[PDB]
Design a protein around this ligand. Structure first.
Ligand SMILES: O=c1ccn([C@H]2C[C@H](O)[C@@H](COP(=O)(O)O)O2)c(=O)[nH]1
Ligand SMILES: O=c1ccn([C@H]2C[C@H](O)[C@@H](COP(=O)(O)O)O2)c(=O)[nH]1
Ligand SMILES: [K+]
Ligand SMILES: [K+]
Lengths: 316, 316
C-alpha cells in the first residue's frame, strides 16, 4: 500500500535503532539517514492504520502560506499545536502575576493538580490572544516560525524576502531549474531559538509536467510527528502544483535523526499489526488558483477511512 | 491597533456595501460617507497586515511638494505610478509611429502577447522622457496633476497661486484659522480631465500646539488605493508640522464613495485574518526644516515589520 514506507521505518527503527539520548531524557531508538518516496498519483498519504486529524494539518499549513506568525489564527480554527511556545513567553513575562509555571511541561505530566492550574492559565491565555488585540500582538506573535522564514526572511540590508513566492514563479518561468529551493535554516538565528526548524529545507523538481518535492528533516518523531509531517508536505506539493497548473508527482522524504521515544514502543507495535486500507483522495477548488488566498473549504479530503486512533504520551 | 480603522472599513464594505457600477465595469461594493481618524502620536499608519512600499509614497509626495508635474523625476526614482497617463498622450500623438495601442489597459490584461508589445513601447517611452530633454518636456509633462494644483493654481487674471506655500504661513501666523484649506478641485478644468482629483480638498487645524489634518476623498479603492492614501497624507501632516515646529496630531480621513472592486474580495478577506502588529515610526531630519527642499534621505521609516505582500488585479 501507499503508507508502507512509514510502516517500514517503524520496523527499521525497532530493528536497528541504537539507543540515543535526547533533550527530554525520555530515551529514543535512533537511525541517521533514510529516505522514502510517495507517488501522489496513487493517493494521498494520510495514514489509515491510525486516525490523523487532517483539519489540524490543513489549517496549520494555510497559516504558514499566509506568512502569518500569530497564534490567533490557529485558535480561530481551534488549532492548539503551537500554544505552548507562546504561553512560555507570557509566563516568563513580568506582566504575569499568577501561579509559578516553571517547566510546566514535566510538572503537569506528573502532578495531576498542576495539570489543572496549568490548564486554567492556558485557557485564559488563549482567550486574551483571541480577544485582546494588543495582547495578541504582544504574545500571540511567535515571530520566527515557518510562516516568516518561508515568506519574510530578513536581509542584512534591512528588508524581507518571499522565498516561496519567488520560487513559485521560477517554477512557472524556469520549471527545469535545479535551484527551486526554500530554506528555514538561518545560522544567525538558530542558536537563540528554542526549537530550530525540524524541517530544514525543501526542494521542488519538474519533469514530464509533474511536480515533485523533497524535504530534508534534521530530526523526526516517528510515532507522533512523521504522520503530520508526511501530510503537510504532500498537501503543499499539491497546492504549489495547483497554482503552477502541473500534474502531481512524488514526495521524497529524507531524514537526519529519525527517532522513536521509548514510551511509544507498545503503541508503535500495535499499529504494525494493522493492515493499511486504500488511501484517501485530495480534492482542490478548481476555480480558485491563488494558493496564498486559499481557505479550509478550498481543500477537501475524500474517502478517508482510518483505523481507530492511537493515544500516546508526548516526550517533554 | 493603529490600523484598525481601515480593517473596519473593509469589513463594513463587505457587510453593507451595495453593488454599484463603475467606469471600468469591474463591479464594486460601495458605501457613501465615512470617516476614520488616526492618532499620529501612537505611530505611523502604514499597514502591517500587508507590505506597502513606503518608497513609492515618499518619492511621489516630494514630487508634489516640488510643485513638479513632469514624470522624469519619478522615473529618476524608479516610480511608475503615473506612467500610464503620460504614455496615453504619446500614443495618441501624431509623432507616434508604432503598434496600435488603443485601450492598452484592458487589451494587455487579457491578451498575453499585447502585454509584451505594450511593455516594450512603455520601456522605451520612459527612456525618451529620461534622456531626451525635449521629449520629456513634451510628453513627460502631465500638467494638471496635484503638484501644480497645490503650488501653481492658475488665476483668471493670468498668474499663479501657491496654495500650500500660503497656507503654511497662515499656520505660523494665524494657527487658529478655520480657513487652513487647500483645494485640488477646479470647476473649469474638471470636465476636460481624464481623472478629476480623487483627493478633492484638505484642511489643517491647530490646537494645544498640535497639527491635525482632514482629507476629503470623493472616491476610494479600499484594497489597492487607501493603503497609499493613508500614508501620503499622514506623512504630509508630519512634514508640514515639522516646518511649523508643531507636535503631530490626528489625521482624519473622510470619504465620499469608498468602494471595493469585486475582483479583490478574496484578497481583502485574507488580509482580515491577519492580526496587525505594532506600527512603525517616522524619523525626519532635525536640522533641515524647509520641507519644500526635502529629499528622500531626509524622511526615514523605522521598525516597519509588515506581513508578506498581497497581489491583486488593477481594475482597468
Ligand atoms: O512535526 C513534528 C514536530 C516535532 N518533531 C520532533 C522532533 C524531535 O522529536 C522534537 C524536537 O527536538 P529535537 O530532537 O529535534 O532536537 O520534535 C517531529 O519530528 N515532527
Ligand atoms: O490613490 C488612489 C488612486 C486611485 N483611487 C481610485 C478611485 C477609483 O477607484 C479610481 C478612479 O475612478 P473613480 O471611481 O474615482 O471615478 O481610482 C483611490 O481611491 N486612491
Ligand atoms: K540556510
Ligand atoms: K475648489
Amino acid at each position: 500500500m501507499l503508507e508502507q514506507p512509514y510502516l517500514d521505518l517503524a520496523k527499521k527503527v525497532l530493528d536497528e535503532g541504537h539507543f540515543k539520548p535526547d533533550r527530554t531524557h525520555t530515551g529514543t531508538y535512533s537511525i541517521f539517514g533514510h529516505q522514502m518516496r510517495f507517488d501522489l498519483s496513487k493517493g494521498f498519504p494520510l495514514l489509515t492504520t491510525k486516525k490523523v486529524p487532517f483539519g489540524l494539518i490543513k489549517s496549520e499549513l494555510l497559516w504558514f502560506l499566509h506568512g502569518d506568525t500569530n497564534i490567533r489564527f490557529l485558535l480561530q480554527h481551534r488549532n492548539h499545536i503551537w500554544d505552548e511556545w507562546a504561553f512560555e513567553k507570557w509566563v516568563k513575562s513580568d506582566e504575569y502575576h499568577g501561579p509559578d509555571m516553571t517547566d510546566f511541561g514535566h510538572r503537569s505530566q506528573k502532578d495531576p493538580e498542576f495539570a489543572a492550574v496549568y490548564h486554567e492559565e492556558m485557557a485564559k491565555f488563549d482567550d486574551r490572544v483571541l480577544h485582546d488585540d494588543a495582547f495578541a500582538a504582544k504574545y500571540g506573535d511567535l515571530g520566527l516560525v515557518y510562516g516568516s522564514q518561508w515568506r519574510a526572511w530578513h536581509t542584512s540590508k534591512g528588508d524581507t524576502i518571499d522565498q516561496l513566492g519567488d520560487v513559485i514563479e521560477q517554477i512557472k518561468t524556469h520549471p527545469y531549474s535545479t535551484t527551486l529551493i526554500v530554506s528555514a535554516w538561518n545560522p544567525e538565528d538558530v542558536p537563540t531559538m528554542a526549537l530550530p526548524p525540524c524541517h530544514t529545507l525543501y526542494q521542488f523538481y519538474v519533469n514530464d509536467g509533474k511536480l515533485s518535492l523533497q524535504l530534508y528533516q534534521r530530526s523526526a518523531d516517528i510515532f507522533l510527528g512523521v504522520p503530520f509531517n508526511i501530510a503537510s508536505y504532500a498537501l503543499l506539493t499539491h497546492l504549489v502544483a495547483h497554482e503552477c497548473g502541473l500534474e502531481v508527482g512524488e514526495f521524497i522524504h529524507t531524514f537526519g535523526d529519525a527517532h522513536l521515544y521509548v514510551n511509544h514502543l507498545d503503541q508503535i507495535k500495535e499499529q504494525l499489526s494493522r493492515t493499511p486500507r486504500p488511501a484517501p483522495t485530495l480534492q482542490l477548488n478548481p476555480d480558485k488558483h491563488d494558493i496564498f488566498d486559499f481557505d479550509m473549504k478550498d481543500i477537501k479530503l475524500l474517502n478517508y477511512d482510518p483505523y481507530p486512533a492511537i493515544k500516546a504520551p508526548v516526550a517533554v
